[PDB]
């Protein structure tokens, strides 16, 4: 059986990247988190206070509490057959905002501005994102030259 | 009392080297790897012939040295004493294990280190010969006699490289004449156009 | 004419006496070079324990000082007037630093006391130049560049133009 330590098997997980050791940069401290900000977890070995458990490295949750040095977030952990939306308390530097919510917020304010525009004009814009359609019909100009002939080059055992 | 090589012939386990963890490995049998007139510059052996392999198998250290001796004997009777350069391009690092019986059985089953093998990919060179341009059939016959000391099926290929160098034989003399290659014994050193040009003027003076 | 901020000036003269024992021998050697310099010394402890020397770890076995400025120049001129203003060539470090070692401190002009005895001294003078405070100050620590360092030959020609000394090779 394996051991059941809190940090077992995290040799390459909580270690810093190559040539990014040293002092933590201070933007990661100066960022501010409201409640309901969608937040990634990425644990870090330069600090040990407030470590997210190795079940949560990479997982993304939602902030339900912000404190003086740490936030409390609500992440989904899957254990054997169920999913638990559970509360953890993570210090501020194991954490980034998720841009997955920010791209949606950009698209919402863009859809709302071009809904409040082109309602007075009368035209009907498209707001859903249809997926990448098949390529429509198009001519290919072979301007001048014949296409280049290819053939498989014969086997030479170069080893 | 060594087990026959058909036991430890396939690349079965994770590569398991003689290290801090597997200590007490008995000494590998092959230890001389390069011989012949190995103190000879690359201007005077143009031909290179490789015993290349064709099976993803494990060659043993004893088979490597038996093949070394079988090539060496034939080339010292054929191409004089010091008119060649043999080098075995495999060094055995994988150590293999032996669970010996004599009554426990299989409880506590993990082998003592027995011997040392080399794991060989498809197209990985086993032995390689550096000779002159008219001792080509002697190279072919030497590696053909050395195939029968190895398990599995090996091929023989005369290469387009100038000896034991990574540069092509039709371009070697042109490059060394225009001073991009500098002889230093068994090999040759390449000269880029990236250095400080004090080395450039030192070459061209 | 040369730029007056490249003057070869001594930065410190550090002296020591390694007695190899503790107690009375060491404390009277401390009294020796306090009597020499005019400032109290510091006892240098031993890092290791090596029983072929008879010293053990953290045992006080040396006495040293560092003197500056004018007092350094007077002590240095007394050491060169005991060795006749004549030094070997190997006495010069690659960084231009030099130094030597004298046999008994009576020769400097220190009056003898039988409660004191005699001790050999080791003089070591590190030179400088205006600007070597850069590598030692706190707030913006930098190095000192290549044109401003002290080479071995430009230090020994300083020696034999400022003390008019004789260096002998070997």
């Amino acid at each position: 059986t394996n051991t059941k330590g809190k940090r077992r098997g995290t040799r390459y997980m909580f270690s810093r990247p190559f040539r990014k050791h040293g002092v933590v940069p201070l933007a990661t401290y100066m960022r501010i988190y409201k409640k309901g900000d969608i937040v990634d977890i990425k644990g870090m070995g330069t600090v040990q206070k407030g470590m997210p458990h190795k079940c949560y490295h990479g997982k993304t949750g939602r902030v339900y509490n912000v404190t003086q040095h740490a936030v409390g977030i609500v992440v989904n952990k899957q254990v054997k057959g169920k999913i638990l939306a559970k509360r953890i308390n993570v210090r501020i530097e194991h954490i980034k905002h998720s841009k997955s919510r920010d791209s949606f917020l950009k698209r919402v304010k863009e859809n709302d501005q071009k809904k409040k525009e082109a309602k007075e004009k009368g035209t009907w814009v498209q707001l859903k994102r249809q997926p990448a359609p098949p390529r429509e019909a198009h001519f290919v100009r072979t301007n001048g030259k014949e296409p280049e002939l290819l053939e498989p080059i014969p086997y030479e055992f170069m080893a | 009392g060594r087990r026959p090589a058909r036991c430890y012939r396939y690349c079965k386990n994770k590569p398991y080297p003689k290290s801090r963890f597997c200590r007490g490995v008995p000494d590998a049998k092959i230890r001389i790897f390069d011989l012949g007139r190995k103190k000879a510059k690359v201007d005077e052996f143009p031909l290179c012939g490789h015993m290349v392999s064709d099976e993803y198998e494990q060659l043993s250290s004893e088979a490597l040295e038996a093949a070394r001796i079988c090539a060496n004997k034939y080339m010292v009777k054929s191409c004089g004493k010091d008119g060649f350069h043999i080098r075995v391009r495999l060094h055995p690092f994988h150590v293999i294990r032996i669970n010996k019986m004599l009554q426990t059985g299989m409880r506590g089953a993990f082998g003592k280190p027995q011997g040392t093998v080399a794991r060989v990919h498809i197209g990985q060179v086993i032995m390689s010969i550096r000779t002159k341009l008219q001792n080509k059939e002697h190279v072919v016959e030497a590696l053909r006699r050395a195939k029968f000391k190895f398990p599995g099926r090996q091929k023989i290929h005369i290469s387009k490289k100038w000896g034991f160098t990574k540069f092509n034989a039709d371009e070697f003399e042109d490059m060394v004449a225009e001073k991009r290659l500098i002889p230093d014994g068994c090999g040759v050193k390449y000269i880029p156009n990236r250095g400080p040009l004090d080395k450039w003027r030192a070459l061209h003076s | 004419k040369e730029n007056p901020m490249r003057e070869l000036r001594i930065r410190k003269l550090c002296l020591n006496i390694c007695v190899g024992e503790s107690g009375d021998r060491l404390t009277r050697a401390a009294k020796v070079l306090e009597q020499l310099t005019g400032q109290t010394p510091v006892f240098s402890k031993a890092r290791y324990t090596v029983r072929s020397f008879g010293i053990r770890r953290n045992e006080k076995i040396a006495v040293h000082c560092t003197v500056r400025g004018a007092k350094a120049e007077e002590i240095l001129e007394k050491g060169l007037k005991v060795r006749e203003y004549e030094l070997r060539k190997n006495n010069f470090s690659d960084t231009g630093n030099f130094g030597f070692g004298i046999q008994e401190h009576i020769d400097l002009g220190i009056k003898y006391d039988p409660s004191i005895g005699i001790y050999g001294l080791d003089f070591y003078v590190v030179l400088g130049r205006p600007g070597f405070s850069i590598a030692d100050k706190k707030r913006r620590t930098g190095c000192i560049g290549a044109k401003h360092r002290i080479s071995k030959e430009e230090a020994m020609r300083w020696f034999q133009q400022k003390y008019d000394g004789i260096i002998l090779p070997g």
């Binding site: 339900y64 509490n65 912000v66 404190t67 409390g72 989904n76 899957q78 054997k80 057959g81 169920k82 999913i83 638990l84 939306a85 509360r87 | - | -």
Partner: protein
């Protein structure tokens, strides 16, 4: 009398037979665990 020791074989089909049900999504989840000084402040702000 040895036996098989650990297995997670039929566990996947056992889980997805009733389905991996994602957690209960509700507006207005609770407030226990929130910073109690902030929760004092919130209760006075509701009280007045």
């Amino acid at each position: 009398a040895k036996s098989k020791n650990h297995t997670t074989h039929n566990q996947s089909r056992k889980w997805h037979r009733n389905g991996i049900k994602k957690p209960r999504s509700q507006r207005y989840e609770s407030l226990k665990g929130v910073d109690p000084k902030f929760l004092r402040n919130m209760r006075f702000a509701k009280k007045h």
